[PDB]
Design a protein around this ligand. Structure first.
Ligand SMILES: O=C(O)CCC(=O)C(=O)O
Ligand SMILES: O=C([O-])CC(=O)C(=O)O
Ligand SMILES: O=C([O-])CC(=O)C(=O)O
Ligand SMILES: [Cl-]
Lengths: 413, 414
């Protein structure tokens, strides 16, 4: 018994991420925090367990005028914010061509708008077989289908044959092919596309476009950019989108959730890049329209907060340095998990950065339910176990790769 | 020249509201707030021209924990917020039957969701001929068509015949009929559908669905709920949604924006109301999914701030007492304009409540342009001039109608 539209009739979300986090904090309220390890949600908590609100960000944010907290922001977002995000995102790497940006609600809004405006209903959207689960829903809630290519070959190199084969397949059947790359610090694996592999990607994508029947739209979910590596090394690939043929458009979906540790402020920028000023202006206008059509403006105090900080050299250096403490702090946790994981013999995907590390298993769900017994609370995907290294203090990181590998060995995994 | 999908290309907002509003702000920043009449945006300013952020709301919002400021909130919203939003919306009038709520990005989010889930591609959506322009963009960006019925008969009463006529034409071409009512305190007019009229509206919808051909989805945008009249009076109509036939689903789009004075912060709930428990559950699930597919989740601090207040009796009465002082201010402002508009002979649509008053004319663009040179900023609609009384102190409101009449006379527009 349903009154919903034809395409909406059967929708129900199974959300593993959020309940699984719930029994976590549920075991950590009543029985004490330190007998529970929380590997669920992508939020940074410090060595003592508290959620990190970077104190430079919070200080700006709390000091704002009534107008910045409750006033309206323009539809496209605050122009200072739009310039500050591109500044932060690009670093010394800002590509040439025409760049135009629109404020979005997180990376989610970015991905939603990109898919709404650049694909037709029924179209397939491409990403790596290791990917953030929501992409599924962003496509499927709209009549699009998310399809995948094997990210890794046998030795864990970017798998170019798998990618090119899948792209050629979408290209044969639809004019626009949208491909989402989530890099650097891929969610779940932590993997980052290398500079040489971007070269091979773009060179292939330029060859495809020269045939003359397709446009390619390259989405890049950069959410983990500030958690992936040295400042210039992780951004250097941004130079590689300069002066691409106009049949290729690039959309960098940048977010403040991680970089500024504002999660529930819901704020991002989608940043379009084109050799062609008209194509780039169309990116701004069509995505501006979808914003008005959806949330109509994004959160003001969070936009104003990150613009203020980035424009004040003292304040911005103070913020880079507080964030880098927390990221050095994460990088080490993954060092401790990487070293013990290797000695004990536990398989784990090739992490270069990011909040998560994943253990490949076909059994993840089962292996997770017995982990929930140990007071170890983690996320189960179709491909394996995802663990939030952002959330796990040094205390429980060491000897953790043992407690997981020990659960799998008992069950035949 | 164009890479966007076929249905996307050409989209361009010509956005009047924020461009005018920007001009006003810059005028006032340079020349002082007290030297500009800023009738642009639906935000409250007090008798000094200061943006109002209610003391009880601000103190709670700034006093939140880090966890409540930056923590992710669940896809459907904070359960406490969903519960508090239904409670302050429905009052003593909560309808009977199955109720399920979902967090949205303001009222835009709720209506974006409603249209995405309850209409097929190409369908028509009905609203009054005086409406908030955003509805049109919501429809057209997703490939629907917003269509209108004349809100007023010749006496400036709810035009039941123009409306029923419109419903019939839609019901003849598609299964679902979505109708958006912006009441009480309509944007742009300030009109509120009266209770008897809701009876006649509802009676007609029941007859319509008794045929077996259609579902009706009634969207009610309640943004102005708290600015419209006495607490119980403005809410009384909610009881009329008790046990409607299951072919009628009522969606109440609530916002924090105006009620709590977080204007820029688009935070609301869409509250579904159905007699049939599976209808309501379905409302919950298609809308949660679309929340994940669009914004993933809603601003956490705004939600908690509101749940906290509504759940505290002492903080709740104090918040209301604060909001009420400002509601009175907006009343007086509208009374002044009306008195004076009637004296100078300047026509005006009927204003019950809300932040805006509208002057009908097909000349708004030329008129507004002239008013600017006088440091008066109002918004030009296609059919009229929208004035936000919420943003215009009394001493400024005095003489305003005369000035608008005089601009229309000088420009040869009567
Ligand atoms: O008055 C306000 O609330 C702000 C409006 C604004 O900044 C804009 O023009 O986008
Ligand atoms: O929000 C989610 O789906 C899970 C998460 O931790 C993130 O990647 O932000
Ligand atoms: O936001 C707009 O388009 C105009 C406005 O003042 C409101 O009704 O919220
Ligand atoms: Cl569809």
């Amino acid at each position: 018994t349903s009154v919903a539209a034809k395409h909406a009739k059967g929708k129900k979300l199974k959300d593993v991420i959020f309940v699984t986090a719930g029994q976590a904090q549920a075991d950590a309220k009543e029985n004490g925090r330190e007998n529970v390890v929380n590997g669920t949600l992508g939020a940074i908590h410090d060595e003592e367990g508290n959620l990190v609100f970077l104190k430079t960000v919070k200080e700006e944010y709390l000091s704002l005028s009534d107008s910045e907290h409750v006033g309206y922001a323009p539809i496209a977002g605050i122009p200072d914010f739009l310039c500050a995000a591109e500044k932060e995102c690009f670093g010394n790497f800002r590509p040439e061509g025409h760049i135009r940006s629109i404020a979005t609600a997180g990376g989610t809004g970015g991905i939603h708008h990109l898919i709404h405006n650049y694909t037709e209903p029924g179209d397939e959207v491409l990403t790596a077989d290791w990917y953030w689960g929501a992409y599924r829903v962003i496509c499927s809630d709209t009549g699009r289908t998310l399809v995948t290519y094997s990210l890794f070959d046998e030795h864990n190199n970017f798998n170019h044959e798998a990618f090119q084969n899948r792209v050629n397949e979408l290209a044969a059947k639809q004019t626009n092919v949208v491909v989402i790359f989530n890099t650097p610090g891929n969610n779940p694996t932590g993997y980052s596309i290398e500079d040489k592999d971007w070269d091979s990607i773009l060179n292939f994508l330029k060859d495809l476009v020269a045939i003359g029947r397709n446009n390619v739209i390259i989405g890049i979910d950069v959410a983990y950019l500030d958690y992936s590596g040295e400042k210039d090394e992780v951004r250097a690939f941004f130079n590689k989108f300069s002066h691409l043929p106009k049949e290729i458009l690039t959309c960098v979906c940048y977010s403040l959730s991680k970089g500024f540790t504002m999660y529930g402020q819901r704020v991002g920028a989608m940043i379009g890049i084109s050799d062609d000023e008209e194509i780039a202006d169309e990116f701004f206008e069509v995505n501006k329209s979808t914003s008005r059509a959806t949330w109509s403006n994004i959160c003001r105090p969070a936009m104003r907060t990150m613009a203020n900080i980035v424009a004040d050299p003292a304040k911005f250096k103070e913020y880079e340095a507080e964030r880098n403490c927390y990221y050095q702090l994460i990088r080490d946790r993954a060092d401790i998990f990487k070293q013990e994981a290797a000695q004990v013999g536990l398989p784990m995907l090739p992490y270069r950065g990011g909040f998560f590390i994943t253990i490949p298993t076909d059994s993840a769900n089962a292996i997770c339910e017995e982990l929930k017994k140990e007071h170890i609370y983690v996320i189960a995907l179709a491909n394996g176990i995802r663990i939030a290294a952002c959330g796990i203090p040094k205390c429980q990181m060491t000897g953790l790769a043992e407690k997981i590998y020990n659960a799998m060995k008992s069950l035949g995994k």
